[PDB]
Design a binder for this molecule. Structure first.
Ligand SMILES: [Zn+2]
Ligand SMILES: [Zn+2]
Ligand SMILES: [Zn+2]
Ligand SMILES: [Zn+2]
Ligand SMILES: [Zn+2]
Ligand SMILES: [Zn+2]
Ligand SMILES: [Zn+2]
Lengths: 427, 43, 260, 81
């Protein structure tokens, strides 16, 4: 019927050019419109629904032409569209079920798939109409902010968290080296799924946290990639949205600079035996807390004091608070049989360097000399005993489970021997 | 938090008999006497 | 006309919402007034000076029953008044407003110059200005909505007009909190910790005006990339500042820092 | 024994101040003042050991010559860099 109606309208427009007088074209077109269409809207609406259930993206163009030829016929089409596309997207990410609630990649990919399909449909069939694009956008907002995954985890602040974690898992430095051309595109898509979420502050909290981690631990894919992501976040939400991130970036840059000047001034100070490297962060920007009441081993004190004196030189009044809980180095272990090389946090260094003198200290004895907290010592010593560096008085006890007391000796296992070199004793 | 609630006239009337039941649990008096006594004491 | 009783576990001058659409201060009865305390709101609303005159009459011809606290006008001659309320059958003396048992029983017988005017003028001026603007918010909402439609049809999408709506909402909130802050800044003897406050609020006032300006004229067209950025940058600032004002007031209450 | 080949440390950097509000703009000291924010902002110190932003205390002294936490006279004692 649609095909024939199109043909008839074409004809009766042509006919006026071979028989009748020109001042009849408009009226004849109007009457043929009111009769061929404009008196069958109901069956059109039902068919439009069925067509959307199927995927015929050509006849839908015909219906757009026809219904648009009359007054305000689109008014029901937009709402019917929005309804159908909402239902389709929601049921689409329903298939994921629980598997999505812990796999960001699959969730974001599913959302992007639905959005791409219907964006592709409403750019050709519907001539990129305004109101139809509006229908797309309303539906996408609806089914991104509330859905099966949001319901299962019991909040509406799970989708922003998942998108933040996807962008994380994307910008890290993995085994494979990502290709800049692909990376830029994938970030550009994450930005779409971003611009639909409606609570854009939880996203900033999570993104700030993850960026802080991967910047501190020197574990990042591409500096230009980080800069580009920050730049488009700023462009989509303004200079006040992304101030903390820009500062959190510029100060890693400045730290890299200042380490070089320390090296230069170091030419006349003879650093005792160690390669020193520091990162000096701001204080309001980064999400880090004070310290855990550490006692600095005597080995590092020389470099500690030299750097603090150097820093106090170049600036007027500024107070470094060292935070040892996240700071790693390297030990050489010129005490065993095979010349290993250990790599652990500063807590491990304090505890190990204690045994440079003896090998018969107890938990209380370790507490006395390093001032560390009780639970922290428990965790650290447990992880050490997990390695074959330190052994209890027992040999086959489940050291991973049997906790110890202040009056419990720790035995330096002299017979330790890993298969390889450069053991990474860390979690 | 500030826990509150919204009621209509019918429910606020039934709450009177509710409070009367609560007090008469321990007073053991006919309902009329309990209502008079409690009403003198500003509920 | 609403018919709902708002039952609560405890009267604490916190705001409640009725479900008929209204939110009021459970203790006093007015709309929710966040920085200012109830008593000063009453004292300022009596002589509010531009909304009602019957309060002048009430103060001029009525007293209040001490027990039940309803306005009472006397047109008798006994002085031995008895409160004819539902359950406030208390009796007292119309003049001394004390209990009548000893009163008249044996022997106990009952028998703004120049500167304040200017201050009141300035403060009431600001308060009434913001009241007028808060009364017209319906027109503001409809205006920006119609403008959203108009800007949208001229080859502009939907998300832009979304940010515009959020900006309007923040603007209305900021005016509604500058209101009661002016009241609070009336009854306040000038000391250091008051110039700080009366200097922050002027800045927030000015920023509010600049934002309410951006909207109306600079909606015009096809300048999205910059106007949108300006408006977003300008309403985050306003929201942060007003939260600073409220925190300052409440901390002052805690530390006993103000003087009236 | 020796077991010290390399060290990489992380240090937070903060102004040398007891408490942080600037008490003029009520911001956080490390952030930007109420003027540099609606768009160098160092910290100035007082001979009574009070600390403020620079642009805040500048305007305050422009109007009145009193340190606005201790109604006393004010003069600069240590700038900030
Ligand atoms: Zn109500
Ligand atoms: Zn109140
Ligand atoms: Zn009474
Ligand atoms: Zn009397
Ligand atoms: Zn400044
Ligand atoms: Zn001072
Ligand atoms: Zn300041």
């Amino acid at each position: 019927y649609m095909k024939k109606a199109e043909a008839r309208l074409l004809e009766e427009q042509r006919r006026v050019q071979v028989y009748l007088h020109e001042s009849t074209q408009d009226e004849l077109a109007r009457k043929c419109e009111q009769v061929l269409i404009e008196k069958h809207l109901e069956i059109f609406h039902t068919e439009f629904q069925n067509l959307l259930d199927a995927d015929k993206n050509e006849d839908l163009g015909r219906m757009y032409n026809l219904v648009s030829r009359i007054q305000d016929g689109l008014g029901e089409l937009k709402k019917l569209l929005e309804t159908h596309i909402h239902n389709q997207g929601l049921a689409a990410i329903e298939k994921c079920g629980e598997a999505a609630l812990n796999d960001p990649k699959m969730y974001v990919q599913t959302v992007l798939d639905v959005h791409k399909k219907y964006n592709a449909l409403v750019m050709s069939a519907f001539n990129n109409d305004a109101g139809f694009v509006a229908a797309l956008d309303k539906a996408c907002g609806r089914f991104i902010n509330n859905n099966a995954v949001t319901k299962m985890a019991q909040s509406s602040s799970k989708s922003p968290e998942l998108l933040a974690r996807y962008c994380d898992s994307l910008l890290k430095k993995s085994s494979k080296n990502p290709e800049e051309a692909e990376l830029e595109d994938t970030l550009n898509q994450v930005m779409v799924v971003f611009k639909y979420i409606e609570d854009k502050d939880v996203f900033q909290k999570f993104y700030a946290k993850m960026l802080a981690k991967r910047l501190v631990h020197q574990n990042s894919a591409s500096d230009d990639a980080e800069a580009s992501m920050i730049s488009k976040l700023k462009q989509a939400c303004g200079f006040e949205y992304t101030s903390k991130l820009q500062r959190m970036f510029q100060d890693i840059g400045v730290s890299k600079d200042l380490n070089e000047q320390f090296k230069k001034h170091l030419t006349n100070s003879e650093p005792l035996d160690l390669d020193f490297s520091i990162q000096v962060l701001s204080s309001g920007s980064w999400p880090f807390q004070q310290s855990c009441t550490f006692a600095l081993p005597s080995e590092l004190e020389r470099s500690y004091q030299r750097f603090t004196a150097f820093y106090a030189s170049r600036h007027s009044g500024r107070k470094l608070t060292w935070l040892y809980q996240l700071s790693k180095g390297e030990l050489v272990t010129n005490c065993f049989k095979n010349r290993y090389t250990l790599q652990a946090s500063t807590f491990q260094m304090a505890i190990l360097l204690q045994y440079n003198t003896e090998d018969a200290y107890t938990v209380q004895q370790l507490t006395d000399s390093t001032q560390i907290k009780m639970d922290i010592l428990a965790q650290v010593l447990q992880i050490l005993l997990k390695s074959k560096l330190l052994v209890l008085e027992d040999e086959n006890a489940n050291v991973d489970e049997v906790e110890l007391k202040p009056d419990t000796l720790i035995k330096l296992y002299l017979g330790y021997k890993n298969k390889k070199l450069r053991v990474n004793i860390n979690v | 938090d500030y826990r509150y609630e919204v009621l209509t006239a019918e429910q606020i009337l039934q709450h009177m008999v509710e409070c009367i039941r609560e007090v008469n649990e321990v007073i053991q008096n006919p309902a009329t006497i309990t209502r008079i006594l409690l009403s003198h004491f500003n509920w | 006309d609403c018919h709902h009783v708002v039952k609560v576990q405890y009267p604490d001058a916190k705001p409640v919402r009725c479900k008929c659409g209204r939110q009021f201060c459970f203790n006093c009865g007015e709309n929710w007034h966040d920085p200012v305390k109830c008593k000063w709101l009453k004292k300022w609303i009596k002589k509010c000076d531009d909304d009602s005159e019957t309060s002048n009459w009430i103060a001029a011809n009525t007293k209040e029953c001490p027990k039940c606290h309803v306005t009472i006008e006397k047109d008798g001659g006994c002085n031995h008044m008895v409160c004819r309320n539902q359950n406030c059958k208390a009796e007292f003396c119309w003049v001394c407003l004390g209990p009548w048992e000893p009163h008249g029983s044996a022997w106990y017988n009952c028998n703004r110059s120049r500167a304040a005017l200017q201050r009141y003028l300035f403060y009431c001026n600001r308060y009434m200005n913001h009241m007028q603007s808060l009364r017209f918010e319906h027109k503001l909402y409809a205006q920006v909505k119609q403008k959203m439609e108009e800007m949208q049809q001229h080859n502009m999408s939907w998300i832009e007009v979304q940010f515009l709506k959020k900006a309007v909402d923040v603007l209305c909130q900021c005016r509604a909190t500058l209101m009661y802050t002016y009241v609070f800044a009336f009854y306040l003897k000038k000391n250091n910790q008051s110039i700080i406050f009366e200097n922050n609020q002027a800045d927030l006032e000015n920023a509010t005006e600049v934002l309410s300006g951006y909207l109306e004229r600079d909606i015009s067209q096809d300048s999205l990339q910059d106007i949108k950025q300006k408006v977003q940058d300008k309403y985050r600032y306003c929201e942060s500042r007003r939260r600073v004002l409220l925190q300052h007031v409440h901390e002052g209450y805690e530390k006993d820092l103000w003087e009236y | 024994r020796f077991e010290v080949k390399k060290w990489n440390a992380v240090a937070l950097w903060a102004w040398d101040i007891v408490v942080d509000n600037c008490a003029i703009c009520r911001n956080h000291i490390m952030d930007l003042c109420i003027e540099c924010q609606a768009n160098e902002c160092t910290v100035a110190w007082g001979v009574c050991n009070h600390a403020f932003h620079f642009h805040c205390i500048s305007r305050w002294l422009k109007t009145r010559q009193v340190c606005p936490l201790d109604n006393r006279e004010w003069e600069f004692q240590k700038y900030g860099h």
